[PDB]
From a paper:
Rab proteins, the biggest subfamily within the superfamily of small GTPases, are major regulators of vesicular trafficking in eukaryotic cells. One such family of effector proteins that was reported to link Rab proteins and the cytoskeleton is the Mical (molecules interacting with CasL) family. In this publication, we present a thorough biochemical and structural analysis of a Rab effector domain termed bivalent Mical/EHBP Rab binding (bMERB) domain. The results show that the domains probably constitute a Rab8-effector family involved in endosomal trafficking, and the Rab-binding specificity can be well explained from the 3-dimensional structures of complexes determined in this work.
Well diffracting crystals were found using the RBD of Mical-cL (residues 534–683) in complex with different Rab proteins (Rab1, Rab8 and Rab10). In all structures (Rab1:Mical-cL, Rab8:Mical-cL and Rab10:Mical-cL) we found one Rab protein bound to one molecule of Mical-cL, in agreement with the previous observations that all Rab proteins tested bind only one site in Mical-cL. Most interactions were visible between the Rab proteins and α-helix 3 of Mical-cL with some additional contributing residues from α-helix 2, forming extensive contacts involving residues within switch I and II of the Rab proteins. In the Rab:Mical-cL structures, we observed extensive interaction of Mical-cL with RabSF1 (Tyr6, Asp7, Leu9, Lys11 in Rab10) and (less interactions) with RabSF2 (Asp31, Ser40 in Rab10). Accordingly, the sequence alignment of different Rab proteins shows strong conservation of the interacting amino acids within these motifs amongst Rab1 (Rab1a/b, Rab35) and Rab8 (Rab8a/b, Rab10, Rab13, Rab15) family members that interact with bMERB domains, but not for other Rab proteins (a comparative scheme of the residues involved in interactions in the different complexes is shown in Figure 5—figure supplement 1a). Interestingly, whereas Rab1 contains a glutamate near the N-terminus (Glu4), all Rab8 family members contain one or (in the case of Rab10) two lysine residues in this region that point towards a negatively charged patch in Mical-cL. In contrast to the main interacting helix α3, which adopts a similar position in all three structures, we observed slightly different orientations of the α-helices 1 and 2, adopting a position slightly further away from Rab1 compared to Rab8 and Rab10. (b) In all structures of Rab proteins in complex with Mical-cL, the N-termini of the Rab proteins point towards a negatively charged patch of Mical-cL (Rabs are shown in cartoon representation as above; the surface of Mical-cL is colored by charge, red – negative charge, blue – positive charge). The sequence of the N-terminal residues of each Rab protein is shown below the corresponding structure: Whereas Rab1 contains a negatively charged glutamate at position 4, Rab8 and Rab10 contain one or two lysine residues at position 3 or at position 3 and 4, respectively.
Author numbering:
A (entry chain A): 1 to 175
B (entry chain B): 531 to 573, 582 to 683
Write the structure that this text describes.
C-alpha cells in the first residue's frame, strides 16, 4: 500500500494574548489559507499536521489556545504534556509583547524541564502598524536562549519554517 | 442551505478513506485466496515458502492500515459533531448578556461541556494510534531481529 504511516508523534502548544493570530498561524500551516474574520477560540482545540524531517515522518499534534483570560485556567492544564511551545505576540500590539514575560513564567511553572520554547512575532506583514521592533523580539529571546521568528499568517512568512524548526529541535534532544 | 466549504473538505476525506478501506479489504481477500493456493501446493518448495513470508508481512501491513483507516473515519465524524457544537455555542454566546436567562446560561454551559468532550474523545483516538504504533514497532524489531 502506498500510503505510509508516521514514525513519531510530537505534541505542540500555541500560547499568546487573544488576537495575536495563533489560530491563523496554525491554519496557514495546516490548510495553507488565511481568513480575516476574527473568530476567537473557545476553550482549546488542536489540529493534525504530519511532516517529513530527517527521512522520518513526524505527526504534529498542535494544540491551539484561547487567548481570553476566561479560558486561561484551561490552557494551564496542557503545559505539562507539551513537547514544544509557541509564544505568539503581535508586532502591531505593544501590550501583547510586554505580556511575553508573564507567559514565559507560566511555562517554567508548569511545563516539563526539557520543553522547547519559541517566540513568534506575528503580523509582520503590517509595516504601517508595526509597534514592536524586530530587534526587541530577538533581544528578549536571546536572554532566554530560545528561538525567534517574525511570522505572517497572511503573507505566509516563516510559518512552515517556524513549526519545522521547533520539531527538529525536539527531535535532536530525544536520545 | 447549500453545503459549506469546510464540510465539503471533511466529506472528501471520508469518501477517500472508504475507498482506501475497500482496497485494503479486497487486497486482504486476494491474499487469502492466494494463501490457500500456496498451502495446497506444498502438500522450489523452499523459496515457495518465503514468497509466502513476503505475503504474511504484506498481510500484516494491510491489517495495520485497516486499523488506522477505521479510526480515521471515527475522527472525521467527531470533527463533524464538533463543528455543529461549536456553531451552536457561538449563536448562544453572541446574544446580549442583558437578555440571558438562567436557562440561556445553563444550555450555553452544557453545549460548552459537550464541546470539550468531543475534543477529549478526539485526543483519545490520537493516543490510540500511538499505542498501536509502539506495538507494531515492537513486533517489527523482533520480526526483523
Ligand atoms: N494582517 C494579519 N492579520 C492577521 C494575522 N494573523 C492573524 N490575523 C488577524 O488577527 C485576528 C486574530 O486572529 P486569531 O488567529 O483569531 O487570533 P487568536 O490568536 O486565535 N486569538 P484567540 O486566542 O482569541 O483565539 C484575525 O482578525 C486575523 O485575521 C497576520 O499574520 N496578518
Ligand atoms: Mg484562536
Amino acid at each position: 500500500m502506498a500510503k505510509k504511516t508516521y514514525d513519531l508523534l510530537f505534541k505542540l502548544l500555541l500560547i499568546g494574548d487573544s488576537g495575536v493570530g495563533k489560530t491563523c498561524v496554525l491554519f496557514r500551516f495546516s490548510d495553507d489559507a488565511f481568513n480575516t474574520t476574527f473568530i476567537s477560540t473557545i476553550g482549546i482545540d488542536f489540529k493534525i499536521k504530519t511532516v517529513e524531517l530527517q527521512g522520518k515522518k513526524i505527526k504534529l499534534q498542535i494544540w491551539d489556545t484561547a487567548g481570553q483570560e476566561r479560558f486561561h485556567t484551561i490552557t494551564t492544564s496542557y503545559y505539562r504534556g507539551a513537547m514544544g511551545i509557541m509564544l505568539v505576540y503581535d508586532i502591531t500590539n505593544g501590550k501583547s509583547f510586554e505580556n511575553i514575560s508573564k507567559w514565559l513564567r507560566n511555562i517554567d511553572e508548569h511545563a516539563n524541564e526539557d520543553v522547547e520554547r519559541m517566540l513568534l512575532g506575528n503580523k509582520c506583514d503590517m509595516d504601517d502598524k508595526r509597534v514592536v521592533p524586530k530587534g526587541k523580539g530577538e533581544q528578549i529571546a536571546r536572554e532566554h536562549g530560545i528561538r525567534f521568528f517574525e511570522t505572517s499568517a497572511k503573507a505566509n512568512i516563516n510559518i512552515e519554517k517556524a513549526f519545522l524548526t521547533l520539531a527538529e529541535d525536539i527531535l535532536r534532544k530525544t536520545p | 442551505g447549500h453545503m459549506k466549504q469546510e464540510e465539503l473538505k471533511r466529506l472528501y476525506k471520508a469518501q477517500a478513506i472508504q475507498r482506501q478501506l475497500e482496497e485494503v479489504e479486497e487486497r486482504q481477500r486476494a491474499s487469502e485466496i492466494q494463501g490457500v493456493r500456496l498451502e495446497k501446493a506444498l502438500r522450489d518448495e523452499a523459496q515457495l515458502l518465503q514468497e509466502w513470508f513476503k505475503l504474511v508481512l504484506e498481510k500484516n501491513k494491510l491489517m495495520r492500515y485497516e486499523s488506522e483507516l477505521l479510526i480515521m473515519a471515527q475522527e472525521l465524524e467527531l470533527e463533524d459533531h464538533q463543528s455543529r457544537l461549536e456553531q451552536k455555542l457561538r449563536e448562544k454566546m453572541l446574544k446580549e448578556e442583558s437578555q440571558k436567562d438562567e436557562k440561556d446560561l445553563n444550555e450555553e454551559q452544557e453545549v460548552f461541556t459537550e464541546l470539550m468532550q468531543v475534543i477529549e474523545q478526539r485526543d483519545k483516538l490520537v493516543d490510540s494510534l500511538e499505542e498501536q504504533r509502539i506495538r507494531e514497532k515492537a513486533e517489527d524489531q523482533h520480526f526483523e531481529s
